[PDB]
Design a protein around this ligand. Structure first.
Ligand code: CLR
Ligand code: CLR
Ligand code: CLR
Ligand code: OLB
Ligand code: OLC
Ligand code: OLC
Ligand code: OLC
Ligand code: OLC
Ligand code: ZMA
Ligand code: OLA
Ligand code: OLA
Ligand code: OLA
Ligand code: OLA
Ligand code: OLA
Ligand code: OLA
Length: 390
């Protein structure tokens, strides 16, 4: 009469324990790397530490809770709710952490000269504390009354041998599907994910527009120099230098680059004064000495600004993979709940698929340290130093 339940149960428990060990070790290493390396002690990494803490808690608490809830043991319904809903608190803390990293990177690309004064460590710690408080409120909403404890499965409870106030502790019997689909999936997971997608698109658009603008100014400085060399009128040299001066002051918006631009503006003002006095050849020769400033200062500034923007793109690509990996690990479990709720004429997904979807969502607490080690050089080197010594 069907295979013994302990056979498939033993497979699930061994696999979950294997995930718990890898979720603890890997994320402990992340926290430790940020702790000892001062180069990783930025506001961006305080949210990654919060994300690493939620993943440590998955291995220490959410997985032992998941193994417990699969037995269907008799328990007080509110206690059963805490066992089933605690993982939702950790998941909600993870989406807030991911959303804060995305906004932080958008502030760093849109207003870098205002980033340090706006995004401070003390303000970051305050955001994390408020977000952990809200994660508890959202994740434990069934404990406030939105649960099936009021309407228990009397048949399954008497067969299990449960006493007064006790229920056969099974997730789908205590947590309502309308909460899981509408409140937890649609409003608390899907809406913030779509927002993160929007924010990352705005980061890639800003970097592209800014890079195109740097090349536009560089071309304007070169093609206008060619116009002066080919000029035969006092107006032609004046019109080319006026457009050159506007590009020089726009690109101006360490002290070596600030000084380098002041000599360039100074040389343009020298040639423009000669152009207004009618001296065509003296203005052309004065505009030729701009080539010396271009090679010694302007080319070095353009190259430095380009590398910083390329570094920001590569960094935003790495953190976007993290958001994609969270979606890939949590969407199957969310999509099966949609089928259970919206399709009552459809057969319930098989038990093996349910526990495969639960296992896949838990492997997300193992992947992040690998992405840091493969995509972020600063994390990779700190990991190597910790492992080699200790
Ligand atoms: C954060 C650290 C200290 C761990 C917290 C302790 C955990 C393991 C405790 C706190 C509250 C506890 C639950 C409280 C109520 C019940 C109802 C009872 O009929 C069965 C056990 C059960 C379901 C408990 C299981 C263990 C539990 C979840
Ligand atoms: C990886 C993510 C992004 C893609 C989503 C793929 C998964 C979740 C989807 C695609 C096909 C789906 C299955 C198609 C058919 C059925 C039969 C129905 O009676 C119950 C649900 C069930 C068993 C579906 C469960 C969810 C399912 C396995
Ligand atoms: C990645 C995000 C933006 C897209 C995911 C949209 C989700 C919510 C979609 C994708 C496929 C959809 C399902 C496709 C099939 C069915 C069978 C139907 O009888 C009831 C609705 C139901 C169960 C759909 C519910 C919503 C669903 C799970
Ligand atoms: C913001 C995202 C919230 C999700 C929007 C779901 C609202 C809804 O349609 O639910 C009510 C149903 O009972 C109607 O049949
Ligand atoms: C670290 C936390 C460890 C385990 C999670 C706690 C899980 C709580 C286990 C409860 C088991 C229980 O209550 O057992 C009664 C059952 O009906 C048998 O008689
Ligand atoms: C840190 C503090 C540990 C807090 C541990 C609190 C664990 C209490 C366990 C509990 O509440 O179990 C009683 C059960 O409900 C009876 O049916
Ligand atoms: C200090 C730690 C106190 C936090 C304990 C909260 C807790 O886990 O207890 C909930 C339980 O359901 C209550 O009966
Ligand atoms: C944002 C989520 C978009 C809102 C999608 C809500 C679907 C509408 C709905 O709930 O379906 C009608 C009714 O439940 C059929 O029985
Ligand atoms: N639907 C569901 N079920 C379970 N576990 C119970 C699996 C099950 C379902 C039906 C059954 O007859 C016996 C066992 N955990 C679950 N976790 C989640 C979840 C967490 C976050 C998003 O979805 N949904 N979810
Ligand atoms: C990704 C990791 C590889 C997949 C490992 C297989 C995972 C789960 C085994 C599925 C068996 C489900 C039996 C559950 C029985 C029960 O507890 O009631
Ligand atoms: C080592 C992990 C072994 C997990 C298998 C335990 C199954 C539960 C049981 O024997 O009752
Ligand atoms: C230490 C980490 C190990 C914790 C893992 C699993 C504990 C779950 C115990 C389940 C109780 C079953 C009660 C029953 O059905 O009789
Ligand atoms: C920290 C150490 C936590 C204690 C470790 C494991 C607790 C496991 C609880 C399972 C015992 C239930 C036994 C039973 O069902 O009768
Ligand atoms: C990756 C796929 C991992 C595991 C496949 C699960 C095995 C399917 C179980 C079917 C047994 C049954 O008929 O109930
Ligand atoms: C179970 C854990 C599941 C997935 C963790 C990701 C596996 C990363 C290992 C690949 C790195 C490598 O190529 O050596």
């Amino acid at each position: 009469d069907g295979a013994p339940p302990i056979m498939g149960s033993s497979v699930y428990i061994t696999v979950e324990l294997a995930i718990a060990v890898l979720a603890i070790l890997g994320n402990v290493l992340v926290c430790w790397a940020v702790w000892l390396n001062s180069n990783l002690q930025n506001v961006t990494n305080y949210f990654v530490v919060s994300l690493a803490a939620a993943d440590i808690a998955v291995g220490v608490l959410a997985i032992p809770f998941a193994i417990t809830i699969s037995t269907g043991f008799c328990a007080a319904c509110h206690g059963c709710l805490f066992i089933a809903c605690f993982v939702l608190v950790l998941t909600q803390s993870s989406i807030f952490s991911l959303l804060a990293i995305a906004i932080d990177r958008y502030i760093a690309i849109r207003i870098p000269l205002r980033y340090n004064g706006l995004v401070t460590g003390t303000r970051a710690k305050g955001i994390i504390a408020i977000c952990w408080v809200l994660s508890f409120a959202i994740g434990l909403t069934p404990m406030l009354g939105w649960n099936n404890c009021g309407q228990p499965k009397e048949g399954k409870n008497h067969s299990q041998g449960c006493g007064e106030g006790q229920v056969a502790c099974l997730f789908e019997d205590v947590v309502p599907m309308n909460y899981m689909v509408y409140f937890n999936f649609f409003a608390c997971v899907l809406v913030p994910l779509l927002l993160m997608l929007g924010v990352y698109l705005r980061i890639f658009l800003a970097a592209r527009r800014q890079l195109a603008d740097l090349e536009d100014n560089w071309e304007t400085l070169n093609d206008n120099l060619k116009v002066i060399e080919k000029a035969d009128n006092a107006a032609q040299v004046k019109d080319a230098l006026t457009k050159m001066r506007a590009a020089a002051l726009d690109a101006q918006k360490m002290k070596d680059f600030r000084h380098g631009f002041d000599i360039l503006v100074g040389q343009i003002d020298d040639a423009l004064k000669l152009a207004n006095e009618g001296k065509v050849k003296e203005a052309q020769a004065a505009a030729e000495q701009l080539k010396t400033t271009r090679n010694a200062y302007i080319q070095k500034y353009l190259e430095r600004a380009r590398s910083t923007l390329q570094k920001e793109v590569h960094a935003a690509k790495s953190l976007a993979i993290i958001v994609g990996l969270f979606a890939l690990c949590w969407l199957p479990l969310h999509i099966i709940n949609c089928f259970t709720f919206f399709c009552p004429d459809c057969s319930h997904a098989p038990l093996w698929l349910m526990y495969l979807a639960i296992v896949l969502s838990h492997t997300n607490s193992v992947v992040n340290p690998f992405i840091y080690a493969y995509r972020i050089r600063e994390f990779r080197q700190t990991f190597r130093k910790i492992i080699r010594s200790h």
